[PDB]
Nucleic acid binder design. Structure first.
Lengths: 257, 192, 239, 202, 95, 37, 37, 60, 66
RNA sequence: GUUUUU
RNA sequence: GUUUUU
RNA sequence: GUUUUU
RNA sequence: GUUUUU
RNA sequence: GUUUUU
């Protein structure tokens, strides 16, 4: 017993000798506000360990919902979050009428193209992560007046194909997710491509996810008066995105062996 | 029973969150609440519900008068300086000291000077010469909250008088507010 | 629906003298505006005054004794003056007068205040003669009162409202005058209340170790039926 | 249309507006705060003084007459209301190291005016023993002839903080420490009449 | 904005942490969105700023060290980016 | 609740000749103010 | 009881042009004062 | 006008005699031109609480 | 209250402003492994008093039947 | 405090 | 006191 | 006299 | 015409 | 928003 026991004895002894007026003394013992404890706080991939914590403070009758009930910004609350998955212009090129069948019109490095310039919605985050796992939704657009005709082959080529491209027989590329799109009939092609690789994750700022290309199925048959400047545009959206490995700002990191 | 914490022994670094109505005692002492009046004079609605002088303007002609309206660092209204943000109805008391005429009065929070050129759209209540009116301007503020300190914390007041002859005079102004919403109290002000 | 008539604010006629301020009717003043922050009332504290309640009626003060025309020295004219402080003597013979004078409400401190406040009144008046003699002194004294009298002259009190005072242990003697006037209420400061006379009935007796003359005090107050009515201007200024 | 608007507390980070001002009067504020500690052994109004190894027991580390205006927060109410009532709380915070030890008795003679060192045996005092919680409070219950008292009138009383036991130390600890005196209104605090101003803020 | 007009020692009215050294090594402050406008311009100081003052100067004994470092860490209880704009281009959300 | 409208004192229109004193109708004189205590 | 508030006469705001006499609306004239005994 | 001032007295009771038994009255006029004049004052009380009656006053 | 109370406020405040993703912070407070305790051990006619004890150790899935 | 009035 | 009016 | 108005 | 207001 | 008053 002791030194904890004192509030009671003093409080009691004071109590025992008390008369009509009452006790002439009160004693209370307890633990100090500053006790021997340890506090731990964890934020995204971080852990703060403090062995000398203090009572946390905050304003009067505070509201941490942080949501503007007036919606001075009429946007979905998760706008900023989904922003990087937004549809963007990945490429544009002008098909030249002279081009032969099987000629490559244009191509886009996948998936590093979504971070093609610092003006890409996904460029921001892509910088702070070395690993990526995502799905794509392409929309190759090619517009041509009715008078003209022709056809282009929009096809997705995984790294395997891109690597050994010359070893593959054109005309068989229809085995890959493609869209033989006959001009004067269709002005846009849609391609939904899931994560395809021989590795669970692909290094950010790499072409390992393969690349989307556009070939000349049948050259452009442009009549005399008809226009001769056909542009091919490639748009891309991320069906699903996933940045995992943390890393310094835009520093080449090897996720592979 | 009573803990040593409530007997004076505490730690200043363990006061957060802000606003701890902790009771303090001793053997012969207890918090005793005694009220001398049927109501409180400390409540924001009551205290501020009472006007206080603002400023005066002397007019020798109809030219319009626009003045930024701000919280006082002078009267009992100074108690507002203990806060950072305000929002709510604003009571403006105007006295028209003139022999023969009328006084157009209007209030807007809009900073643009031009919007006040055509005074009628804004309001323009009419106080005949020798009369005083008390108009309650609503919170038509383009900002959800009014920093309480700003030289224009309160919206601008417009006074244009439709005089008739060579008559001239002066317009004294007093301000008060109806039900005030103050937030995030800041540190006490200094003295001049 | 009442949509056949355009909606309008009520129209009312303003009676004569709008803005006129009535400083006569209490029902008017009590309704005046309040400069109070919230037009609120305070909690009064009687205890600090040693009282359990405030004082509501003034008539009760008018019912408090006060010496008549009080002076530092006793009547030097055998009591034929207004001084309610006179001496009774072994020397004075029976039927001789020890005091005589015409009584007015103003002759009393407390009452004189009401006299300078109210214009009229009604009710009975009580006068209490206190003769301060020793336990050995003995004798009788008859004090009468002719209501509404004006001729200040000694006269037999056989027909007047009188009270015979026999000296003993309780040497304070009272005499009531019931309200007596043509009018229902009477001027507070008008016609006299009447002739007040205190004649000797039996010579003040004494012995070797007792005084041959004693001091007397005359007090006056209003009866339990006393009332005052109209407040009027002032005829004097207090200090 | 003689209409009312919908207020937005969230933008202020609050869940509700502030209705009563008394709560602000119940917020601690340093007494006659200064940049430098009392250069007169604490015999001034500065609520920022030093306690020393040098000062002897019964020697004074601070003494002065207390007025509501000596406090930033309160001084505002002093310039707003004319009267008030309620208890006042002063909190002395001595900032020493974990090695420093000693005691200090701070008393208060309510309504006192003679600024002179005097035995606190009969005054409302609080003995401060240095430990982990080095902030010490002292309450003064309302003491005046009147039910309410002038906001800016008679002093609150004599405030004295005398040395009880010399501040001890060692080779690696300070021989003197800094102290701070704060003041606030009790939970029973009240203010009553608003009056004119005696000073102009900025 | 009006810092010089405010009385030090009263700053305890703001979300603070008088932290007594040799007792506490860290202070915690949870601050919600506070401004007179629904939203604050990105890349602006409109949300105000956190500061650290000297309540009572450091009493450093003779032998004791004399290089005390003060560090400020920050976490976002809740974040919300709304207005779209070019890359890091100053845009005025205010009037 | 009627909190969508700011509370206000009643407003009324004053008919012609306010302050005019009618010394013809008894119903008017009997309603005059009283100087009684 | 309502003794926390001092009793007061009702306060009202007088609309524009008090004393103005409307000689257009019958509903106004029929309500005029009467000089009848 | 007739304004009813409340008992905002720092003293529970007002000795009835004091040269300031009743609180001080303030009058400031916001004149406009050379105009001048005079302000007459009258006093009355609403519900008065009097205590401990003392002896009647003397006359001058 | 305090300094013990912090895991809850931070854990809660983090909790209140949480959106679809969840809270962005978790805080937990408790006593250190090295607490202020005293250990006493007695063998045959002996008593060992230690005021700064440490967690006793032993081999993997040990058998003390001997 | 019916301490505006009943 | 219907002694404002019904 | 719904002869203020419903 | 809830086209004063609920 | 009993954030005119009860």
């Amino acid at each position: 017993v002791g030194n904890e026991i004192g509030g009671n004895l003093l409080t009691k002894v004071a109590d025992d000798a008390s008369n009509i007026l009452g006790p002439n003394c009160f004693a209370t013992t307890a633990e100090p506000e500053n006790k021997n404890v340890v506090q731990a706080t964890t934020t995204v991939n971080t852990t703060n360990l403090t062995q000398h914590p203090s009572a946390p403070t905050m304003p009067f009758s505070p509201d941490f919902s942080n949501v503007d009930n007036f919606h001075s910004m009429a946007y979905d609350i998760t706008t900023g979050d989904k922003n990087p998955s937004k549809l963007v212009r990945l490429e544009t090129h002008e098909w030249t009428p002279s081009w032969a069948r099987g000629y490559q019109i244009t191509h886009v490095e996948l998936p590093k193209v979504f971070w093609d310039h610092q003006d890409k919605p996904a460029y921001g985050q892509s910088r702070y992560f070395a690993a990526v796992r995502c799905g794509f939704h392409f929309q190759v657009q090619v517009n041509v007046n009715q008078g003209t005709a022709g056809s282009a082959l929009v096809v997705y080529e995984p790294k395997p194909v891109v690597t050994y491209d010359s070893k593959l027989e054109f005309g068989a590329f229809t085995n890959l997710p493609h869209v033989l799109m006959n001009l004067a009939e269709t002005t846009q092609a849609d391609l939904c491509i899931p994560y395809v690789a021989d590795t669970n994750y692909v290094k950010t700022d790499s072409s390992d996810l393969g690349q989307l290309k556009v070939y000349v199925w049948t050259p452009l048959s442009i009549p005399t008066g008809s226009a001769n400047q056909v542009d091919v545009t490639i748009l891309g959206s991320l069906l699903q995105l996933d940045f995992q490995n943390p890393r310094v700002f835009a520093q080449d990191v090897n996720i592979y062996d | 029973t009573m803990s040593p914490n409530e007997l004076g022994l505490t730690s200043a670094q363990d006061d957060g969150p802000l606003g701890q109505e902790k009771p303090n005692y001793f053997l012969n002492f207890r918090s005793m609440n005694v009220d001398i009046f049927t109501v409180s004079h400390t409540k924001v609605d009551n205290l501020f519900g009472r006007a206080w002088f603002f400023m005066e303007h002397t007019f020798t002609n109809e030219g319009q008068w626009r003045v930024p309206l701000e919280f006082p660092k002078q009267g009992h209204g100074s108690l507002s300086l203990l806060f950072a943000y305000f929002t709510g109805e604003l009571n403006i008391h105007v006295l028209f000291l003139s022999e023969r005429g009328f006084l157009r009065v209007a209030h807007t929070y809009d900073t643009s000077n031009d919007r006040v050129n055509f005074l009628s759209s804004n309001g323009v209540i009419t106080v005949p010469a020798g009369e005083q009116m008390t108009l309650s301007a609503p919170y038509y503020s383009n900002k959800p909250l009014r920093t309480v300190r700003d030289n224009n914390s309160l919206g601008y007041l417009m006074c244009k008088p439709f005089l008739t002859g060579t008559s001239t005079g002066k317009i004294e102004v007093y301000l008060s507010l109806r039900c005030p919403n103050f937030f995030f109290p800041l540190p006490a002000p200094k003295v001049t | 629906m009442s949509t056949k008539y355009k909606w309008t604010r009520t129209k009312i006629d303003i009676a004569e003298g709008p803005g006129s301020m009535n400083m006569a009717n209490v029902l008017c003043t009590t309704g005046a505006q309040s400069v109070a922050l919230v037009g609120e009332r305070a909690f009064y504290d009687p205890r600090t005054a040693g009282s359990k309640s405030r004082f509501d009626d003034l008539v009760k003060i008018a019912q408090l004794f006060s010496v008549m025309a009080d002076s530092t020295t006793p009547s030097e004219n055998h009591g034929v003056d207004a001084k309610g402080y006179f001496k009774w003597s072994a020397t004075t013979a029976p039927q001789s007068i020890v005091h005589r004078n015409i009584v007015y409400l103003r002759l009393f401190p407390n009452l004189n205040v009401f006299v300078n406040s109210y214009s009229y009144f009604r009710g009975s008046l009580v006068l209490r003669l206190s003769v301060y003699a020793s336990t050995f002194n003995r004798g009788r004294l008859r004090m009468g009162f002719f209501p509404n009298a004006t001729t200040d002259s000694t006269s037999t009190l056989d027909n007047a409202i009188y009270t015979i005072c026999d000296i003993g242990s309780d040497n304070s003697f009272e005499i009531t005058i019931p309200y007596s006037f043509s009018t229902w209420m009477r001027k507070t400061n008008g016609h006299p209340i009447g002739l007040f006379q205190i004649e000797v009935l039996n010579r003040l007796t004494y012995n070797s170790s007792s005084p041959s003359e004693v001091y007397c005090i005359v007090q006056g107050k209003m009866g339990q039926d006393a009332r005052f009515f109209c407040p009027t201007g002032s005829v004097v200024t207090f200090q």
